[PDB]
Amino acid sequence: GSSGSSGVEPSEENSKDCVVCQNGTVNWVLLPCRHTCLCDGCVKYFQQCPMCRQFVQESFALSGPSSG
Ligand SMILES: [Zn+2]
Ligand SMILES: [Zn+2]
């Protein structure tokens, strides 16, 4: 029972998300830089940061009070 609205999306559907698959929520930091642009899986896809391209020496999952 609609008129013809074939486009229902929020103001902005992009923020602190993966810049590789933009499908899953990034929950891993790429230290040192500590950039979260790689999903739990994409984190292994690129040994470096897809933003700063810094040799990833250590990586940990946020798993904190920071979530949407
Ligand atoms: Zn991803
Ligand atoms: Zn980075």
Side-chain angles (χ1 to χ4, degrees), residues 18 20-22 24 38-39 42:
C18 181
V20 179
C21 71
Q22 69 152 114
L38 288 178
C39 309
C42 308

Side-chain angles (χ1 to χ4, degrees), residues 10-61:
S11 288
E12 202 57 87
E13 63 172 70
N14 201 272
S15 168
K16 284 270 207 158
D17 52 308
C18 181
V19 311
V20 179
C21 71
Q22 69 152 114
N23 272 0
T25 180
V26 285
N27 194 50
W28 286 85
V29 300
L30 308 171
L31 282 152
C33 92
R34 213 157 66 90
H35 285 170
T36 58
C37 294
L38 288 178
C39 309
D40 290 56
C42 308
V43 65
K44 80 210 182 205
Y45 270 58
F46 325 82
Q47 177 174 110
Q48 278 174 239
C49 193
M51 272 211 309
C52 62
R53 296 288 283 276
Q54 185 87 319
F55 162 82
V56 175
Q57 80 186 316
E58 45 210 61
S59 308
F60 80 83

